[PDB]
Amino acid sequence: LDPRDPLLRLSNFFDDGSVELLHERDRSGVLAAAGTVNGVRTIAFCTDGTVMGGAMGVEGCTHIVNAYDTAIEDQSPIVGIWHSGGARLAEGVRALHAVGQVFEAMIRASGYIPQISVVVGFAAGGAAYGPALTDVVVMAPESRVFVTGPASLGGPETHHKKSGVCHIVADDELDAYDRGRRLVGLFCQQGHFDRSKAEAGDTDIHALLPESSRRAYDVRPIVTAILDADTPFDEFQANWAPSMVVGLGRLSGRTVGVLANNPLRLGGCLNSESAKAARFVRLCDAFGIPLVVVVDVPGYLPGVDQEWGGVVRRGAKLLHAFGECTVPRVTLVTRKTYGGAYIAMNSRSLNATKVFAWPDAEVAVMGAKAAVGILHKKKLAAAPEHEREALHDQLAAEHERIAGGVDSALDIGVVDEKIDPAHTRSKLTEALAQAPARRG
Amino acid sequence: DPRDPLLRLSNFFDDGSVELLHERDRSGVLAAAGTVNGVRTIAFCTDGTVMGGAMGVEGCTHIVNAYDTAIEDQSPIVGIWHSGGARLAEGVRALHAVGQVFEAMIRASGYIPQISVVVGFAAGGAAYGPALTDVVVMAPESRVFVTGPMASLGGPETHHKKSGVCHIVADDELDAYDRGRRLVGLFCQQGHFDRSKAEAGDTDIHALLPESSRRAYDVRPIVTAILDADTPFDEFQANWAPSMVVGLGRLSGRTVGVLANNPLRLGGCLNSESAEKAARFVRLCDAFGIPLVVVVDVPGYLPGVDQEWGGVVRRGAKLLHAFGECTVPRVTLVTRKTYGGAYIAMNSRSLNATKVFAWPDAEVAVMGAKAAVGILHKKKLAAAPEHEREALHDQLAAEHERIAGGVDSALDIGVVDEKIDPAHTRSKLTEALAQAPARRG
Numbered sequence: 001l002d003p004r005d006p007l008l009r010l011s012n013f014f015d016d017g018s019v020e021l022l023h024e025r026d027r028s029g030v031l032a033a034a035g036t037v038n039g040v041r042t043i044a045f046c047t048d049g050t051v052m053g054g055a056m057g058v059e060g061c062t063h064i065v066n067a068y069d070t071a072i073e074d075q076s077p078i079v080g081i082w083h084s085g086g087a088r089l090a091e092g093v094r095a096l097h098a099v100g101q102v103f104e105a106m107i108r109a110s111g112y113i114p115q116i117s118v119v120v121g122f123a124a125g126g127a128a129y130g131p132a133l134t135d136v137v138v139m140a141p142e143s144r145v146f147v148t149g150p151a152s153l154g155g156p157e158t159h160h161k162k163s164g165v166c167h168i169v170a171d172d173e174l175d176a177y178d179r180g181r182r183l184v185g186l187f188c189q190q191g192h193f194d195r196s197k198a199e200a201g202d203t204d205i206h207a208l209l210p211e212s213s214r215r216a217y218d219v220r221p222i223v224t225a226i227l228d229a230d231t232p233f234d235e236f237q238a239n240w241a242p243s244m245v246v247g248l249g250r251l252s253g254r255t256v257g258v259l260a261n262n263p264l265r266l267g268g269c270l271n272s273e274s275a276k277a278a279r280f281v282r283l284c285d286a287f288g289i290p291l292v293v294v295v296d297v298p299g300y301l302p303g304v305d306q307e308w309g310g311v312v313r314r315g316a317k318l319l320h321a322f323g324e325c326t327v328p329r330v331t332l333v334t335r336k337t338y339g340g341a342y343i344a345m346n347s348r349s350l351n352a353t354k355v356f357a358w359p360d361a362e363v364a365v366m367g368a369k370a371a372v373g374i375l376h377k378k379k380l381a382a383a384p385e386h387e388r389e390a391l392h393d394q395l396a397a398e399h400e401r402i403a404g405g406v407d408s409a410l411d412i413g414v415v416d417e418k419i420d421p422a423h424t425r426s427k428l429t430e431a432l433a434q435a436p437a438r439r440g
Numbered sequence: 441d442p443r444d445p446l447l448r449l450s451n452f453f454d455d456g457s458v459e460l461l462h463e464r465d466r467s468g469v470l471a472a473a474g475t476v477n478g479v480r481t482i483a484f485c486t487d488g489t490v491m492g493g494a495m496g497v498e499g500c501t502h503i504v505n506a507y508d509t510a511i512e513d514q515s516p517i518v519g520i521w522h523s524g525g526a527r528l529a530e531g532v533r534a535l536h537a538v539g540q541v542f543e544a545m546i547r548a549s550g551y552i553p554q555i556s557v558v559v560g561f562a563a564g565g566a567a568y569g570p571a572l573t574d575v576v577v578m579a580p581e582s583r584v585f586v587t588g589p590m591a592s593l594g595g596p597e598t599h600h601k602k603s604g605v606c607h608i609v610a611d612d613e614l615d616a617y618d619r620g621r622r623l624v625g626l627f628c629q630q631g632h633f634d635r636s637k638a639e640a641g642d643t644d645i646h647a648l649l650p651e652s653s654r655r656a657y658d659v660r661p662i663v664t665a666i667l668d669a670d671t672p673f674d675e676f677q678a679n680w681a682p683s684m685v686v687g688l689g690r691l692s693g694r695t696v697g698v699l700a701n702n703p704l705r706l707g708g709c710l711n712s713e714s715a716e717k718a719a720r721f722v723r724l725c726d727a728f729g730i731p732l733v734v735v736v737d738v739p740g741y742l743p744g745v746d747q748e749w750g751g752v753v754r755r756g757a758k759l760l761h762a763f764g765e766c767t768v769p770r771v772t773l774v775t776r777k778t779y780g781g782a783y784i785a786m787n788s789r790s791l792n793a794t795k796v797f798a799w800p801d802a803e804v805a806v807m808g809a810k811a812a813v814g815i816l817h818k819k820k821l822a823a824a825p826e827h828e829r830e831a832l833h834d835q836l837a838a839e840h841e842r843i844a845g846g847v848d849s850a851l852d853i854g855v856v857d858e859k860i861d862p863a864h865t866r867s868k869l870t871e872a873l874a875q876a877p878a879r880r881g
């Protein structure tokens with residue numbers, strides 16, 4: 001049907017007048033074309049919902065693989081638009097194989113050219129799976145995903161927003177293209193840092209914290225404050241693993257990625273799904289996008305039935321991701337950062353470019369009460385049971401008053417600089433701009 | 441004291457081979473060089489006799505230095521673990537130093553083999569460090585404590601063998617070192633393929649299949665049939681994600697990795713944890729030049745809980761990436777059936793499989809005949825009277841099977857390279873892996 005026409009959809013994604021088909025238009029079920037997105041040379045393809053419901057066949061898959069080869073050869077970002085019931089069943093194994101070849105193209109392009117998927121209609125089988133292999137998936141609210149064993153039929157607002165496969169949910173198809181468009185800008189027009197612009201955007205970000213250090217808040221406004229005032233923050237997977245906020249924005253015009261623990265959920269603790277962070281770190285590392293890491297993390301948690309496997313493994317990926325990272329990655333410790341979670345959240349030991357702290361920030365092996373329970377075991381043990389807890393609290397209060405602390409952390413060298421939170425934005429920019437583009 | 445580090449290092453290394461990398465102290469770590477059946481190995485042991493083996497700045501420094509040495513020499517490195525975690529009194533300095541150990545392990549990852557042998561209590565950084573290594577062997581008296589800011593305190597038999605972090609559970613401490621030693625030999629004495637040795641060990645492996653294709657069976661005897669008959673198959677994570685069997689062994693003397701769907705569980709289907717188990721294992725073998733045998737009998741994939749799909753979708757992608765990027769030889773053997781996306785993931789030609797073999801009655805298809813027909817012939821089936829619908833469905837299915845699924849069709853298309861006599865499975869696999877380049881695909 002006319003609204004599902006591939007050339008139409010492609011023409012809606014591309015800059016007006018920039019479309020050049022990569023092959024003769026047929027009934028293969030895909031149409032690939034070159035064009036520009038705000039002037040950036042971009043390859044794109046669109047499944048043809050007007051033909052067998054966009055079902056993927058041999059000839060169609062060959063157009064996609066060809067488009068990928070073209071994008072890789074030119075080092076151009078590649079955007080797929082999806083509306084497809086999966087493989088053409090009647091073609092059998094030939095289509096099966098052809099689909100796998102699409103996957104292999106996507107794997108070859110991985111970390112080399114940006115791959116953006118825009119899901120605008122129905123998607124099942126290999127057409128649901130394809131997007132899963134790309135870097136950022138944008139879903140139109142009308143889009144539907146279906147997957148079954150040897151079963152789920154949902155839209156993004158009903159399922160996929162909360163499952164970490166969908167990165168961004170749009171307002172409508174047109175808006176989905178707009179976001180897709182803005183995504184290639186973020187990857188392919190990364191811009192440059194500007195001290196002046198950074199300084200002029202400075203606010204007392206610290207005022208966004210609640211009065212009690214012991215209580216939760218939403219970190220998102222802090223992210224907002226750091227990033228350029230009237231440029232959107234493109235948060236990924238906002239409703240999946242919400243103890244961890246990640247996404248792309250601009251910092252004095254320069255594309256940067258942000259990771260921030262969100263105390264709003266699970267007290268900001270890391271867990272299996274949030275350790276989301278690993279994949280995002282690899283994304284920015286792949287494409288030369290520097291990182292701002294906002295740390296407020298009291299530890300890590302197990303899953304459903306207190307199972308530890310997920311967080312131990314996903315955590316390992318996080319450690320690797322940061323440890324291997326070579327783009328600049330600056331850490332800001334806002335309130336608390338303890339133990340293994342501290343090590344994992346862009347610590348110095350993992351080659352963090354620079355670590356900043358707010359004056360009241362705390363860096364420690366563990367919580368005061370736990371530490372004190374261990375350090376003063378003799379006095380605690382020897383106490384009468386009815387005073388033991390009061391003693392413990394007294395010990396803990398004094399320990400948090402005189403231990404932890406930025407001054408001690410500066411002395412060791414795990415924190416590089418304590419900063420006035422009113423210059424948070426400008427200090428971050430400086431540290432990132434002064435950093436080498438690679439190594440660290 | 442059995443927990444003496446030099447004692448433990450001596451029980452691990454070849455007798456007489458031990459040379460310390462530093463003067464003994466009370467830092468809580470002893471690192472040494474030595475040999476394991478001849479191969480130069482670097483090892484370290486936390487010292488349980490000193491502060492429960494708690495890790496401090498100087499001990500960590502000994503481990504980091506041991507890592508630097510092993511990396512420099514391209515020697516495998518083995519940690520023996522018995523530690524309560526960081527020395528709390530040293531505070532942030534010790535925390536920092538623990539991270540530095542992790543950083544060293546990350547630098548070593550994929551470059552030299554890292555083997556952890558957990559022999560005692562492990563907590564904090566001491567439980568976590570092994571999680572960064574390639575293969576974790578756990579002594580049955582080892583105990584891991586992990587906690588949030590409830591908590592978990594268990595041994596290998598009750599907790600960790602079933603959680604995928606522990607690869608191998610040993611019979612005792614000494615047996616743990618022996619498994620460790622054998623793992624060194626598997627990584628560092630990979631040997632070479634032998635065509636004659638392979639042939640002499642051929643059996644009718646098909647006989648290990650049930651007469652009926654609808655019925656479950658254990659794939660482990662099939663793996664055992666393929667590998668050298670008097671050589672251990674060092675299965676990893678046997679109790680975690682048991683629909684997938686992976687591990688290391690020898691094929692005519694040559695170290696190989698095996699991945700095999702196991703229809704004993706979940707019908708042999710892929711799912712979140714079995715995809716993750718395969719993906720890590722493929723990466724591990726790819727990293728160290730170890731060729732792969734992929735025994736495929738997979739009907740599809742399964743959601744999680746609660747029918748959560750997120751996990752299998754994401755871990756599946758990892759599995760696809762792992763095979764797609766793999767450059768060591770990887771040969772597939774389709775034994776019974778392989779369908780759809782699962783078929784793609786399990787080392788398909790589209791992901792640059794080195795060679796795909798199939799047994800004569802194998803089937804490679806987008807789905808089962810009955811299901812394909814339910815879709816292709818939707819109208820006739822619906823238009824059919826209910827009393828006659830099933831018979832019509834089976835008739836169409838039987839006809840459809842004739843032109844879709846079988847090996848002959850697959851051979852023509854090119855997704856299967858060769859149909860083989862199951863009595864020559866072992867030797868045929870050996871030949872394909874032997875004549876493959878050490879690197880490309």
Ligand SMILES: C[C@@H](Oc1ccc(Oc2ncc(C(F)(F)F)cc2Cl)cc1)C(=O)O
Nearest residue numbers: 086087096125126129710741756781782785
């Ligand atoms: C040919 C077939 O293609 C598919 C179908 C499903 C599909 O999704 C998955 N494939 C494999 C796994 C894995 F690897 F976990 F087993 C998971 C999924 Cl969702 C990928 C390709 C189709 O479109 O019918």
Ligand SMILES: C[C@@H](Oc1ccc(Oc2ncc(C(F)(F)F)cc2Cl)cc1)C(=O)O
Nearest residue numbers: 306307308309567568570571592599603605
């Ligand atoms: C049953 C238990 O499973 C666990 C327990 C601890 C756990 O964390 C570790 N397990 C093993 C090691 C090893 F083997 F490396 F020492 C380390 C950790 Cl952190 C993972 C899963 C659970 O989830 O409660």
Ligand SMILES: C[C@@H](Oc1ccc(Oc2ncc(C(F)(F)F)cc2Cl)cc1)C(=O)O
Nearest residue numbers: 270300315340341344525526535564565568
């Ligand atoms: C210094 C500290 O070292 C640790 C403690 C726990 C620890 O475990 C974890 N660390 C981080 C995560 C993550 F990343 F998932 F949040 C998970 C664990 Cl289990 C690692 C190192 C200690 O031994 O107390």
Ligand SMILES: C[C@@H](Oc1ccc(Oc2ncc(C(F)(F)F)cc2Cl)cc1)C(=O)O
Nearest residue numbers: 128129131132159163165166747748749750
């Ligand atoms: C809530 C739902 O989550 C899903 C549902 C489908 C699902 O599979 C996909 N979802 C989204 C896409 C996208 F965004 F790429 F189009 C693809 C797949 Cl395979 C993954 C998780 C669930 O777990 O049941």
